[PDB]
């Protein structure tokens, strides 16, 4: 996932969940990319949809 335009603190509140490689559900891609940045890029996408 291209998370190059992150971090950004505010995200839409559309629920379109992504499941991270950490088995956490992120509410949408914006939430996921913020988490990727927080992890210094270790977090990857396991799959679209909730874990």
């Amino acid at each position: 996932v291209d998370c190059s335009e992150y971090p950004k603190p505010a995200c839409t509140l559309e629920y379109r969940p992504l499941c991270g490689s950490d088995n956490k559900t992120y509410g949408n891609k914006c939430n996921f990319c913020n988490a990727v940045v927080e992890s210094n890029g270790t977090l990857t996408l396991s799959h679209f949809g909730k874990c």
Binding site: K8, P9, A10, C11, T12, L13, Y15, G27, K29, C30
Partner: protein, 274 residues
């Protein structure tokens, strides 16, 4: 042909529209990813952008257009139907095409909306921390007579943990949670003391770029039903203060369960507009 999304009858907006009150002469700003103003089922009469390189009247994400359609999709022979289809609709772009943004962009949008005389602000967006300037901006908007509505958050529940984000968590903002068409809380809907009211947020059908329609989930979808409801109330009772509109919405809501999970419950704009 026009279809009526389920949220309109569920919050009883159809009853108020049938009385002849549809949000005419009420200004609503949708602070979001923009609105596709050229969509046949929307009438965007102004706005501004606080995202560099993007115009107020385009929407490269789709979210802002969907939110706007729940507030204000035109009553005509096509598409869908908004809660308050006669409102004066303004696009205030504070999030980019990726659906993300800075607190400063949001603050600039809230200030623009206040300065330009909006009656209602919708913010279908959130962040974990907020900012001093965001608190100031919503407090200023509300003190100067703007009804400020925001999606509560999609952080679900976990024991007694408060999962409301900002700006919903600010006391000057109405935090709106999500129910589905059975009036059941959506599992993603955030919870906590600040949760104020619920509105439809699961499987919501609305406008979407380009010139089409889509079904989305989120407290983002719930917030504009409440923003539209505030507009309906003001179109029927134009001299009410923002606090009076807010109180009407919460005090006439249909109880659904513990306020931690549901706030005062599902809005009922027919009762709220009495």
């Amino acid at each position: 042909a026009q279809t009526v999304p389920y949220g309109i009858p569920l919050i009883k907006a159809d009853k108020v529209q049938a009385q002849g009150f549809k949000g005419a002469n009420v200004k609503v700003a949708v602070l979001d990813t923009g609105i596709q103003a050229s969509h046949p089922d929307l009438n965007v009469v102004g706005g501004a952008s606080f995202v560099a390189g993007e115009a107020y009247n385009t929407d490269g994400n789709g979210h802002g257009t969907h939110v706007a359609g729940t507030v204000a999709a035109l009553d005509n022979t096509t598409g869908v139907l908004g809660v308050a289809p006669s409102v004066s609709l303004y696009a205030v772009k504070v999030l980019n095409s990726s659906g993300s943004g800075s607190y400063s962009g949001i603050v600039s949008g809230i200030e623009w909306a206040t300065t330009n005389g909006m009656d209602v602000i919708n913010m279908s967006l959130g962040g974990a921390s907020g900012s001093t300037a965001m608190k100031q901006a919503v407090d200023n908007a509300y003190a100067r007579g703007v009804v400020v509505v925001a999606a509560a958050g999609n952080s679900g529940n976990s024991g007694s943990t408060n999962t409301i984000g900002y700006p919903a968590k600010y006391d000057s903002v109405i935090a709106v949670g999500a129910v589905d068409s059975n009036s059941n809380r959506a599992s993603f809907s955030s919870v906590g003391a600040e949760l104020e009211v619920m509105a439809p947020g699961a499987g919501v059908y609305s406008t979407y770029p380009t010139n089409t329609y889509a079904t989305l989930n989120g407290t983002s979808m719930a917030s504009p039903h409440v923003a539209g409801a505030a507009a309906l109330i003001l179109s029927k009772h134009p001299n009410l203060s923002a606090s009076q509109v807010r109180n009407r919405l919460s005090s006439t809501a249909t109880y659904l369960g513990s306020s931690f999970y549901y706030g005062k419950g599902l809005i009922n704009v027919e009762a709220a507009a009495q």
